[PDB]
Amino acid sequence: TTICGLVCQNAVILGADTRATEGPIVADKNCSKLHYISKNIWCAGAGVAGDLEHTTLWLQHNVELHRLNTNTQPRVSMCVSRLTQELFKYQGYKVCAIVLGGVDVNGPQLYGIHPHGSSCLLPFTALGSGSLNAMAVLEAKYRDNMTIEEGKNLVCEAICAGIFNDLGSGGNVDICVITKDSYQHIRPYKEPNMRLYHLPHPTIYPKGTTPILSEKIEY
Amino acid sequence: SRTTTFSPEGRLYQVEYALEAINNASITIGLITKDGVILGADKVFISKLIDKANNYEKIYKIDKHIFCGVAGLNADANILINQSRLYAQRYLYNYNEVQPVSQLVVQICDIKQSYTQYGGLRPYGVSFLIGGYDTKDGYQLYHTDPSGNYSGWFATAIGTNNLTASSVLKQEWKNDMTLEEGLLLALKTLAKSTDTEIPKSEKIELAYLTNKDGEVYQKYLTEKEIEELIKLYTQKYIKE
Amino acid sequence: LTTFSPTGKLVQIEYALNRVSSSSPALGIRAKNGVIIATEKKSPNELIEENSIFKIQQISEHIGIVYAGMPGDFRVLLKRARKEAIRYSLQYGSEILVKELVKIIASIVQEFTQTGGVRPFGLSLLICGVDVYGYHLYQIDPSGCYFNWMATCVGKDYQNNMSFLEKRYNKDIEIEDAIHTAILTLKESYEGVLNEKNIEIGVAYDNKPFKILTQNEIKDYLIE
Amino acid sequence: MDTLIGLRGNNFVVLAADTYSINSIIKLKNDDNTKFYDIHGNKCLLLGGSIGDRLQFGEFIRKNVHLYQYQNNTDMFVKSFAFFTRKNLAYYLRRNPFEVNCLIAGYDKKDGYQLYWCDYLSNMDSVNKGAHGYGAYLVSAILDKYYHENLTVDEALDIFKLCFEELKKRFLLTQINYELRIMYDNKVETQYVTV
Amino acid sequence: YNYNGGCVLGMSGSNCVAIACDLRLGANTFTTVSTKFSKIFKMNNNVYVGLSGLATDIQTLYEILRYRVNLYEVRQDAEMDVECFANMLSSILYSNRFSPYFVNPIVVGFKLVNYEPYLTAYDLIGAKCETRDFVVNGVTSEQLFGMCESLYVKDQDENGLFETISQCLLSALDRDCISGWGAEVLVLTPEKIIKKKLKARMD
Amino acid sequence: EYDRGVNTFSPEGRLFQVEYALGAIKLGSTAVGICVNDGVILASERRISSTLIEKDSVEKLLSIDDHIGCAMSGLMADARTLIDYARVECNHYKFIYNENINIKSCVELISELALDFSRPFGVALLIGGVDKNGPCLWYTEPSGTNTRFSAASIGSAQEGAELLLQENYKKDMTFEQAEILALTVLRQVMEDKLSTSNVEICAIKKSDQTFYKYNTDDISRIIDVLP
Amino acid sequence: TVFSPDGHLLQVEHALEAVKKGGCAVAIKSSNFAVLAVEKKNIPKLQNPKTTEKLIKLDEHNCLAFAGLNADARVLVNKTRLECQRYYLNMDEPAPVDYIAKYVAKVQQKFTHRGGVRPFGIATLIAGFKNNKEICIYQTEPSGIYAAWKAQAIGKNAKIVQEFLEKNYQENMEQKDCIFLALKAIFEVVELSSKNVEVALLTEKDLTFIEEQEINSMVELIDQERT
Amino acid sequence: TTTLAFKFKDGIIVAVDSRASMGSFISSQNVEKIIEINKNILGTMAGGAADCLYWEKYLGKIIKIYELRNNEKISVRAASTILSNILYQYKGYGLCCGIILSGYDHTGFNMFYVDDSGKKVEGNLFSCGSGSTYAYSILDSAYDYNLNLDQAVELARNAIYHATFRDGGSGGKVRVFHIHKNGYDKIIEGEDVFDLHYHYTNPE
Amino acid sequence: WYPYIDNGGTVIGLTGKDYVILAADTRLSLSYSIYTRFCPKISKLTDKCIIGSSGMQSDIKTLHSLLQKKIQLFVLEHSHYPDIHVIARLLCVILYSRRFFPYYAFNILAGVDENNKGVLYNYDSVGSYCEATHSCVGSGSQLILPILDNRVEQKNQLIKNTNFNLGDDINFVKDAITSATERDIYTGDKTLIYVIDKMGINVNTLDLKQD
């Protein structure tokens, strides 16, 4: 669940892995941790995935409502200034490590919110279980004012470093660019090396020892 | 004055005007057959620019086996339907079974009775023919008023021109009525109430329950009533 | 406390209907590939900027609304309209249906009639938009009722304004062809003959998100 | 604790219970107690648990059903009665403990004789047999050996005599007295027997 | 909790989905009191929910979910698609955040002229685990994930899917002790539904 | 004419809504109570004109407690509400303090409930008892004026019984002295005969400190003395 | 609700007159039972059971036949049946008729004393059992007053039917004799239609109706008794 | 804290002790364990002293209201159902009490038992308190229900003496009240009973 | 934070025909160090009924002033000085008014109501009032109560000292409190022997062992 975030010369690139878990097993090999706050601002959070649902959808519509009240696009410091008002009252109830940021009237910001309520601006960060592995390769290859392609391979290596060097990670890696024009929901490096292919066994059709067949033909 | 005050005659004022306010509304017909209860309607036409094909505001749905034909203030009708749908569902949530209509009108006439007793608010200018099927006593057809004095029936014609349309059901109605014969029976009283001889078919709407052990409760399309309208031409179950 | 009357009709509601019968004309017409709406924007002078005062607002990415009465009430009902487009969007991840939305606003307007010490809404709404069951164009009455219209007007002198639509409307009209029959129902209906970018027109724009047509865009249709 | 043996036939429903009233871990306040909660509409509710909570819930659900049986002239359906008391138990769980165990039994023309089991929590389910308390661990098995279909009502009394006698021999607290609430053909007699 | 076990597994064939659940409602952990407690419900004619967990919430959440659906269902002539229904369960469970609703639901059904599989998982808090492939939740989710991993073809026939889900449940139920006897499988096609109750190990 | 509000005053310094109920208490059945040096004796009529009544369900002399008895007049439907309230606070007093409440402390609370500022209670009482300091008899009004009376009368015929007691009350009168006196004033203002059913006297003796309703048998020996 | 300048109540006397325009209902006490009677009307070939408009139950031993506003009885009965069962839950005894009547009278009184609430335009009569094996038919008015009776009648022109009942009311009667006395009260509905009178025989703490078969055997004898 | 109950052919003999302990120290010796709730119903405390003396006296407020609001004698069943329902509100509040109500209602000589959890159980031979199990054994050893008051009141003294000697909780003076058909009689204190001695040596 | 402490002290009650004797000690000892040697633990209410107590002073100055409020509110509403039977039932509900948080202060109610009738009410910290001819309450509860037990109730075969005059009995309470200061720690030095005769109360003091 390593989620990397950084800022390029004009946009912010996020990225994470699509593999949730329960502690000893794998939940699913594809669960897009990225989100859609609006057109010019995206979100990605770690921690418990249940509390992240009613913190993203709640923020998506509350920003959309505020976007329809005025006429301009929403600003990134308004939404972060609204989660803390709810996260403080749920200091031991709501727990989430959210990373979000997009283009607005100011530069491309990237805030990192803590479960207890702490939040501050950050030019590059990594949140999740294997966040330490993601921030490791990030601090060694982070130049200032890099191009979009210069940040695309960096966040790809930042997640790939958190894929092999961590247990609570895996699956594909999806990223997103949050430029002022539009967004991108690309899924590069979907590990197609294929070390070994499976062999599904389609069982034959004799019967399965069924005593009752209450078939119904409702339209 | 207000609804809280009485009158020297013993009657009321706000609930008396509401009883007259529904007399200036479109008619609705109720009818219990030997197969299932059926209902009638009259779409008042303000103009020819309504949809006239997908919707109709005179017959609604309360539950999967209870349905009413409203008649009166169309605005205030939507509140009771939004209030009866909750009671028809809160009974399911509390007793895991369908709600009998005899226990529904009591639950809904009390919400009208509660307005004509306190609060200082105006009553509900609405009255409707609510019917359904139940395992306790078969098909039923009740009828509420703005005061709350509900009563069971076999056929009712509230709205405009009640006394004339109700008299049609005093003779032409029979104890044994099939579904197709009941529809033709309720089709004439729906047409002669508006002083016409044939419905324009871009008018009146009908509904019917006829529980086939699953309570199908099918409504009617503008093309399905054409066959019913054509059958009225040959076999005329006249005014009388 | 808007009680009854011996004739069997609300008197405060009938008085409220007179207010919408003397305001700017609002007009909506549905089509087979979208719905259009229009409003005669009575510009009093050049001081009022057009991008501030509007008659076409949005409820979601697919719902358009039109006002026809008390301008001070053009915002309170909008706030509860957008709030209901969010409360439905929080639970149900999909979009809010027009029939599900109009039945709530009709219930909100209704509660301002039976409550004691309140005043009914002095406006008539025109909710339109793309739905998964086709297109829709509803009209909300200050009494609380709603109609499933096809083409209607609610402003001043609509008894004869609807007469243009009763004779110049077909069941299968495209959205581009319905624009000129709507402009004709505004310019050729009454005064306001100097229609030069003084009419707000919203469209469903054939299942795309709700688009508020700009002044120069309407100018292409204003030449006829 | 106490045993609440219930068995549903095809045309009858019998209920069994202990007529002991355990006060503390030592003394018995009274023999031949009252655990059943007879309802007018051919329904025999039977609770099991702490005497204090076993009493109030038995009366909160009896008058609340007799009230419903009078607000409409009809009688409450047995399928609706079982899911109603389950809702009240689930309602009385997030606030108060209510350590009770119940067996809901009744009869209605729409579905025949029914029987419903429950728990301390709301675990309502239609069954054919089953018991409660600590005595259920020695009687829920004997019922499976003598549960042929189409049981006559007189057969179940011999099953309980083959069941109560086992409780007198292999249970920690040998319950001697027992109360039976037979519900054969719209009649609810009480053939309470000892041993 | 590990009390009153049960499991629910949803499969997604080519154009027909299927669900299965056990039926052994246990009083205590190691007890059996009933073998006729189905854990799948007909929420609609195109929506089938499968609940698993404590019985104090399986029946309670089903009564709440029916009351919320049936109320919403009559406000439109058409039925309720799974898209708007799956998002509802994530709201009911989150509204009951610091509430004891111990359930792990499974929502299957056609997404809609066309027909899509649409399977979805959930947790005790309400995380919408979207999955266009097989899905499972319950107390025996550990012995079902790997079980439905090496025995799952992408697109299968209507009858072929039933054999896959049959061996997927009969092998896992015989490996666990609390999720006992009974397997009311439920294969469903856009025009026909099939309710088969397998003959599992009665131990 | 100022009658809309309930709390409006008058230019002459007077109330209005309270004064309306002042005439409403002059329509109930007559009653009379005498406070003697040995106790308190009450009396009332029994308008049971229709013989179909049970004759015991309708009573004019209820009991506030076992030591305080009282009469009623005016609105009988509202008189029971004040008596039910007095039966609570007097009994609530016994739960707090072990001694019986004093009438001076009880009539002051029965009058404060007639100060709802609903509507004022159109009822006048004749609360009497032997609580402490001998026996006392009080007479309340809807206006709240609590005047301790030695012998008063309330009812439709309270005017005639007023002057009769002024010409008959003596301080050294015992129970049997006033018992005949409690009936001679009833014999004057009565549209019937003082039988053994129309009169419902009861008294509170100072010895036992409790009230005892004089039944049909005991009143027959007192109504036949012919005052 | 306020007073009147002379002393009456315009909001109560109006409501008390509102019950006069309603179907008549007569009750009659006996030794160990109490048969009731009511006279209603229905439209022919429609409205099959009249949803049991009269003779409402409250418990296993407490019948109730109101008169007056048909729609205002539901709120009165539902606020009574709840109290009849709540008493059984707090005192573990089936509610006596003395408590129900004291509750129905307190319900109507709680509606006229308060402001902004329309009074219950309904006069009833409750027939049940006391704590001992006794039967006392009560009768409550919209003003709040209540009293037991041996026979009583309320509704349209209740004076002429209560006056007749005052003369030939015997002390103890037979089950059929007590019915004939109640069936001799068809002095309100002309021609004595069998489809109009409804009677119930409340006996041995178990209420039951009376079939129309034995009604015709008793309603036809009255026509052959006026000559 | 030993309490009794009999329910003979005549009234119900109620007998208690009067020792109010506190840990390992006797607080007093004159605590009246018999409270007259009404003229015909007399309760009996146990366990906590103030824990139920208030509620027993609180019942007197509710009972005296019904004796005046309905001018009739309330039943013992009604007086017992009140205490069982006003104790649920303080069920998990740490209170601890056991009351044995008894009296003469409209039918028979009813009797009830009321505890903290609400164990409203009627019967004929109740007993509650610390040294109550001993008294619940002497009675079952010799009980016949046809015992005349002259030979039955001695049983109440003997049932307490054998339950106040084998137990260290109860003690002090022994009270015994007999309910009549209209009121209740009285016998006040024994304080030292040598039912099995001749002044020779201590028994075991 | 435990909100229950014990300041220590004692109150001794005795009776007779027309006299009650209440005596206390004024040592307001804190946790383990004596703070002030003068803090009266008995306060008069009426002219014939006083009250003694021994718990923490937080629940004593409040309880004595709250009782003076509810007793002064009663005298000007009835114009009659309350007896002891009514004041005994008054503290029964005040102490039970805080059942969840009881007043950590046991009490003593002494006084005369009839012509003679020397009554003395004592109870625990929850509110179970019980009449008694003699009682002790406080830190020296377990040390003075058996001494007084050998004067009113008897165990001797010869019932010695049948008469009990106020003169000799006054010196007896001084003898008991002096016997408390030597064997108990919390027993104070300055004592207040309050004697309620038929006409009124006395403020007879005595200074004991300052130790």
mmCIF file of C-alpha atoms in Angstrom, chain H residues 25-28 30-31 49-51 53-55 57 94-95 173 191-192, chain I residues 89 92-93 96 99 124 126-132 141-142 145 153 155:
data_model
loop_
_atom_site.group_PDB
_atom_site.id
_atom_site.type_symbol
_atom_site.label_atom_id
_atom_site.label_comp_id
_atom_site.label_asym_id
_atom_site.label_seq_id
_atom_site.Cartn_x
_atom_site.Cartn_y
_atom_site.Cartn_z
ATOM 1 C CA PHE H 25 -18.745 -4.612 63.563
ATOM 2 C CA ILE H 26 -22.371 -4.517 64.645
ATOM 3 C CA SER H 27 -23.708 -1.052 63.919
ATOM 4 C CA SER H 28 -26.909 -1.301 65.936
ATOM 5 C CA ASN H 30 -32.779 -1.990 66.973
ATOM 6 C CA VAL H 31 -33.264 -1.749 63.214
ATOM 7 C CA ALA H 49 -30.398 -1.044 54.889
ATOM 8 C CA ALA H 50 -30.790 2.344 53.217
ATOM 9 C CA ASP H 51 -30.644 0.585 49.842
ATOM 10 C CA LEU H 53 -35.680 1.409 53.284
ATOM 11 C CA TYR H 54 -36.127 4.355 50.960
ATOM 12 C CA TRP H 55 -37.809 2.306 48.231
ATOM 13 C CA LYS H 57 -41.036 3.928 52.089
ATOM 14 C CA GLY H 94 -24.865 -1.394 42.350
ATOM 15 C CA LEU H 95 -27.858 -1.627 44.647
ATOM 16 C CA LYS H 173 -33.692 -9.020 69.176
ATOM 17 C CA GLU H 191 -33.074 -11.426 72.847
ATOM 18 C CA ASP H 192 -31.793 -14.693 74.409
ATOM 19 C CA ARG I 89 -37.098 11.836 58.032
ATOM 20 C CA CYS I 92 -33.345 10.379 55.297
ATOM 21 C CA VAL I 93 -34.060 11.827 51.864
ATOM 22 C CA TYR I 96 -30.556 9.437 49.681
ATOM 23 C CA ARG I 99 -27.225 7.649 46.277
ATOM 24 C CA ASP I 124 -24.938 5.348 58.381
ATOM 25 C CA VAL I 126 -26.396 6.327 53.029
ATOM 26 C CA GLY I 127 -29.612 7.167 54.876
ATOM 27 C CA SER I 128 -31.018 4.292 56.957
ATOM 28 C CA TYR I 129 -32.213 6.168 60.013
ATOM 29 C CA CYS I 130 -32.741 4.097 63.136
ATOM 30 C CA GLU I 131 -33.704 5.201 66.624
ATOM 31 C CA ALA I 132 -31.323 4.350 69.446
ATOM 32 C CA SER I 141 -16.868 4.462 66.874
ATOM 33 C CA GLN I 142 -15.501 1.021 67.631
ATOM 34 C CA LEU I 145 -19.718 2.131 71.648
ATOM 35 C CA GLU I 153 -28.046 -2.370 78.126
ATOM 36 C CA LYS I 155 -25.056 -8.197 80.794
#
